Design a protein around this ligand. Sequence first.
Ligand SMILES: [Mg+2]
Ligand SMILES: [Mg+2]
Ligand SMILES: [Mg+2]
Ligand SMILES: [Mg+2]
Ligand SMILES: [Mg+2]
Ligand SMILES: [Mg+2]
Ligand SMILES: [Mg+2]
Ligand SMILES: [Mg+2]
Ligand SMILES: [Mg+2]
Ligand SMILES: [Mg+2]
Ligand SMILES: [Mg+2]
Ligand SMILES: [Mg+2]
Ligand SMILES: [Mg+2]
Ligand SMILES: [Mg+2]
Ligand SMILES: [Mg+2]
Ligand SMILES: [Mg+2]
Ligand SMILES: [Mg+2]
Ligand SMILES: [Mg+2]
Ligand SMILES: [Mg+2]
Ligand SMILES: [Mg+2]
Ligand SMILES: [Mg+2]
Ligand SMILES: [Mg+2]
Ligand SMILES: [Mg+2]
Ligand SMILES: [Mg+2]
Ligand SMILES: [Mg+2]
Ligand SMILES: [Mg+2]
Ligand SMILES: [Mg+2]
Ligand SMILES: [Mg+2]
Ligand SMILES: [Mg+2]
Ligand SMILES: [Mg+2]
Ligand SMILES: [Mg+2]
Ligand SMILES: [Mg+2]
Lengths: 166, 286, 97, 148, 80, 140, 101
Amino acid sequence: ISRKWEKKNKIVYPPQLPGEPRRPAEIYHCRRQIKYSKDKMWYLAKLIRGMSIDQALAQLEFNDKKGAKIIKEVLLEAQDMAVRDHNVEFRSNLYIAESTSGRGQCLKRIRYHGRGRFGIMEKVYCHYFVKLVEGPPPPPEPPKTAVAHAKEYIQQLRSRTIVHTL
Amino acid sequence: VKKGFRAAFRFQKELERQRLLRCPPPPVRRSEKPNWDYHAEIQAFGHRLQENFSLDLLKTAFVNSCYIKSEEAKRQQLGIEKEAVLLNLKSNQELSEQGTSFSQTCLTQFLEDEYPDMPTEGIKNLVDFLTGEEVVCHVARNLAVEQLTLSEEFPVPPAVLQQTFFAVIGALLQSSGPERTALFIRDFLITQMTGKELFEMWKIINPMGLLVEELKKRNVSAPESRLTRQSGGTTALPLYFVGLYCDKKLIAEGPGETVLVAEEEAARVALRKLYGFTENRRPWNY
Amino acid sequence: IGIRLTLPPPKVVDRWNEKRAMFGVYDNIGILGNFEKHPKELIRGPIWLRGWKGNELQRCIRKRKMVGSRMFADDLHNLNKRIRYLYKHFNRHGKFR
Amino acid sequence: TARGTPSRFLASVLHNGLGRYVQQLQRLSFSVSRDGASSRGAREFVEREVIDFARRNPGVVIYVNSRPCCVPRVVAEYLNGAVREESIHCKSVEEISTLVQKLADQSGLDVIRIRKPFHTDNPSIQGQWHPFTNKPTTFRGLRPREVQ
Amino acid sequence: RPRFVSLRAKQNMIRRLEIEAENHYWLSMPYMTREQERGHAAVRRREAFEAIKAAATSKFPPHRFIADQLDHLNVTKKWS
Amino acid sequence: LRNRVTDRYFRIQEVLKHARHFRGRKNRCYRLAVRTVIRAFVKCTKARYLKKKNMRTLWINRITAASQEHGLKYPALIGNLVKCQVELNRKVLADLAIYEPKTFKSLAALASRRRHEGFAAALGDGKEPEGIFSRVVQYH
Amino acid sequence: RQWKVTSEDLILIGNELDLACGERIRLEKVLLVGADNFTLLGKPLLGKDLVRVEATVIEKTESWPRIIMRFRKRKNFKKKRIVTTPQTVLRINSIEIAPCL
RNA sequence: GAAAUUGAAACCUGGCGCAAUAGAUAUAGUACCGCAAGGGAAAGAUGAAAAAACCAAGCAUAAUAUAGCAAGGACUAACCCCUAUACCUUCUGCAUAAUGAAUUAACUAGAAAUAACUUUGCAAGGAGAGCCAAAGCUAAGACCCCCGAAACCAGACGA
RNA sequence: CCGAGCCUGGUGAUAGCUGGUUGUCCAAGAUAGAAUCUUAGUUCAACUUUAAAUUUGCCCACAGAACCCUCUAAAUCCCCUU
RNA sequence: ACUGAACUCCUCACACCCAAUUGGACCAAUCUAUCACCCUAUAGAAGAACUAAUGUUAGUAUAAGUAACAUGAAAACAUUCU
RNA sequence: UCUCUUACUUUUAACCAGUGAAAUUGACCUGCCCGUGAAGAGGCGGGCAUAACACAGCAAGACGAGAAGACCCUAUGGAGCU
Ligand SMILES: [Mg+2]
Ligand SMILES: [Mg+2]
Ligand SMILES: [Mg+2]
Ligand SMILES: [Mg+2]
Ligand SMILES: [Mg+2]
Ligand SMILES: [Mg+2]
Ligand SMILES: [Mg+2]
Ligand SMILES: [Mg+2]
Ligand SMILES: [Mg+2]
Ligand SMILES: [Mg+2]
Ligand SMILES: [Mg+2]
Ligand SMILES: [Mg+2]
Ligand SMILES: [Mg+2]
Ligand SMILES: [Mg+2]
Ligand SMILES: [Mg+2]
Ligand SMILES: [Mg+2]
Ligand SMILES: [Mg+2]
Ligand SMILES: [Mg+2]
Ligand SMILES: [Mg+2]
Ligand SMILES: [Mg+2]
Ligand SMILES: [Mg+2]
Ligand SMILES: [Mg+2]
Ligand SMILES: [Mg+2]
Ligand SMILES: [Mg+2]
Ligand SMILES: [Mg+2]
Ligand SMILES: [Mg+2]
Ligand SMILES: [Mg+2]
Ligand SMILES: [Mg+2]
Ligand SMILES: [Mg+2]
Ligand SMILES: [Mg+2]
Ligand SMILES: [Mg+2]
Ligand SMILES: [Mg+2]
């Protein structure tokens, strides 16, 4: 096994110079060996990927999936430790930067079939990983405008050369 | 576990390369890196450019004021300033000044001889370009001036490296005389002009204004702008050629996406023809 | 991935231990010692292999002949089967006949 | 293959042979073993050939390290800042002399695919073709099916 | 599938026929008769075969030099 | 296991490095990668012939275009230039068409002139003086 | 090969020229020489007196490795060769014309 | 496939053996399977003290945009253009037919003679008794795979 | 899982049959047959490979190679010179 | 007339496009002798190289989050009801 | 049963939550028509078509998948019976 995500909170950066923008706080937190499919967990992880902490918690609270409450617990723990240990100013002033599911260590069992024959059943486990970053959630990338497309196309035309010549 | 050493060693080497690629080390000056002898290097610098340099003068050319300050401060901090009293190394000011002055004068001389029709402003701007931080630093980098220069910080800031390069010019001036140094300027700085449009080197604003002033200087009629050729006027991709006529005689024709852009282009074409910076101009004689 | 992520502990070989230093001594016992002893007598190993050489089948026949009686029952059975198999292989099988 | 590899256009460092030709090779470092069969040829090279090479190429600084090593190497550095490491392991004197001369002749440009076997900054003298070249002008510049 | 003869194919055929017709003509006039020809190249032909025979007979193992054997000692040539 | 391969990683990597830019499991799975890489290398070797061929058809296409601007056909241009004892290959003629259009017009003019000299010679059966551009420089 | 060259132009020659780097050579065999307003073209070559083109050797290199691969299916036929071709880079220094017509 | 006949030297604590799919089946004849005789596994890795970094497949980071053995030639440019009928094995010959492969890691298949050839030593003799010899004899080098039946017999174990 | 149980041994049974047979590079290299419980195989010849010895090999021109049957051609064999 | 190959020429180079088979030049890694000492040299050895055996063991995919599986109701969770 | 099928209930189903297999799989960026390949083409040629992604149906094709067959032939392969 590897447990690198835990070690990520142990990084210490040198003190910042006065003439430097303030570094946003990063918090790394994970739950290991969740009895739940990583594939099922993925959807919930994807859901809250860009969201603020409060938005994410709201969405998870009213979700019907088993993994939703597990992510809610992990998020709450992360929010708490962010303020306590990592010197985050406001508990609300956090957004999900990374939200991922990974495979866990699994167990093989036997599934009996309707003859002498059988199948191998696998008890799924997963890890949930989250990275929280201090600050407002970054604005979503705006949909490409007609003018943007037009500009790109002109750029393509202007870029072209006489090929296979002097 | 397989018995053997060679495979494990090879793999260690691979992992080392992977670590280096993933996390590249901060740039380090060549002086600090092994296989370095300063005296051998400066001699080789001289020989590379097929020129005779005074060793002492060239040494002086490479040393910088910031380096001297840093060395003094380091000696003060270490506590051996009184113990290791030594004559202060000569600064970079004198040689750099002499080199810069000579470079500018010879560039103006070359440019004036080759292009007589050019105005003073234009030649000034072209000399400025050739003596600019960009090209001079590029030449300096690729002549191993950065390697030999003694500086406070690495990589060497562009201002310092420019100064050092002109110091080298100055050292050569004192060593080999003006004519040899002129040949050096021609071989390095002038060659940067090759494959470049005039207005790429000399940035201009309102070329039509420049053109009308130039034509009234030569006592001819003000240019008349006419649409020579046109394609796809209503489309998002039009081509327009506009021509400039002086007493119903063609001086320049310029293409553009719009009429206004075409006008500007025609004006620039006109200026190129007037000043003699045509694409088909006689190439520089070396 | 079947490659080790650390170097193996370095091998130190004493090239001048007593065994290596005195290797080859008495190989010329016969020619320098009035032929009182053959060099083959210096060979230390199995009774059946002392100063003799032969292929797998020949070696097995020799082992059975010489130490066969003293062998363990299971070992003797294996040797019998080995000879029986090697007989069939060498006599009945191959490319050249 | 080309699609699997980077490419570049034909280029010089600083318009090398335009004003005056400047040898691109700057430094040449040799790692040779006093004892060791790999560096045998290398040793013999250092004994006879390196002095003459140094005389022939004054612009290049030659370093000879003479340290314990299983494989002897030559490191070539160029003015543009390229570094090339070449193994002279179990090579004859002739082979090493050949390789060293090649390094001297080479510039610092990467030995990758060169897209065009020629390079020009002024391809045209008469003026690059456009659709309106080889087209006649018309009176009053009238488009087809234009009344006025 | 039926194949048909084009004009190009006919032209290609007649071109070759024209060449071979000229070939016939140049084979028509021999410089020497058969009787005059007899034994003119015999001496050269013979000597050529003796050259072949000499090559065949000269087959033998190459020379072996003491220098070649001793030069292998140079594998352990070292600096002091 | 008295002897077993310790260098298999590097043997795999030699093939795999060429497969990196492929899509699918071909890029990473050796069994599949090796087959595609052999094909890639074979194609690469055979492509040299096509490169040369494709360049020439490109040149001919370009020459045809430029000739047609001057109202001349491709066979006319090439044929008559050869008859004028000028030996300019198709690569250079295509380059001239793009970059030196005045020179190309001159060559088109020369070809056209020679073409008319040919027609005049053909029409004028018997004893007639040779065309000015028709006459050929003799080398001995 | 026919090379359309101008002043300060680089060309890659796919062979070793047996010339030291920095050596200036005159390229004979000029077919066509053109300006903005005139062209002179020889039959097939222009005279020596008429035109002079000068180049210099600036670089002598190996080409990037070229793969030669042979494969025939179901025959157990597979060959691989790596070739590098010697190369020379020439800088066309000057083109000069003398009044000889 | 003999025998008469000849003749046999004696120092254990060593290894050009394996190193967790290897070497014993073995951490164990255990767990498990079978009424029974019987078959028969798998696996462990900190540090002096616990009274102290990168790499297989699979995925995720990061779904997708006309078109086609997945590439190659390329190109300013990923794609667009042009070129290109997967690999192995079998059948008298043919592949495009049929066979085999989800993928990764590890494991998994040419063993020896007579006679010849090559290189030495000695030479009408060679060989450290025997054997060969009308240039031979002595020594060395160098050629001969893997998996799979239905069966047959012997001795046990089973109503 | 009985046209003759199961287990162990003989046993690495045997299989002219099926499948498989693992680095790189170069070179030479293809279709007369005979016998055989033989045509799914093997042995000899033919062809192929290597090494060695020695002289001819191939291409060929005059001359030359049957009558009978009442017919019969392209050709073939042999062969100096070249 | 032109287009049109790996044919031929051109610049440079050259052992570098057949099945079975046969001859030759090299060689990965390992162990040993002696070297060497950031990973090698000359030799001697050998369980000496795997894109393929419905190969063996292990891991992880695909089909697939599919097929399939499960708890009568209310409530004080005392109990009652169906 | 059918002419000639319809309506309703339960199971299944589909959706939501939990748990979670199997045969199968060379790689696939997996179209249509005509032709070619002795039949037979998603992939070859000539035409045509073509933003990209789910979910639910279907069984015309992928000589669709798994064994087990039946037919003919072969083995100097077995076995039972007479
Ligand atoms: Mg049951
Ligand atoms: Mg074990
Ligand atoms: Mg075991
Ligand atoms: Mg991976
Ligand atoms: Mg296509
Ligand atoms: Mg299959
Ligand atoms: Mg009973
Ligand atoms: Mg009973
Ligand atoms: Mg068998
Ligand atoms: Mg061959
Ligand atoms: Mg018989
Ligand atoms: Mg038979
Ligand atoms: Mg048979
Ligand atoms: Mg004859
Ligand atoms: Mg062609
Ligand atoms: Mg070729
Ligand atoms: Mg050829
Ligand atoms: Mg050749
Ligand atoms: Mg093996
Ligand atoms: Mg493998
Ligand atoms: Mg397999
Ligand atoms: Mg489904
Ligand atoms: Mg269901
Ligand atoms: Mg359903
Ligand atoms: Mg569900
Ligand atoms: Mg399965
Ligand atoms: Mg069809
Ligand atoms: Mg098609
Ligand atoms: Mg569907
Ligand atoms: Mg198909
Ligand atoms: Mg039988
Ligand atoms: Mg039998």
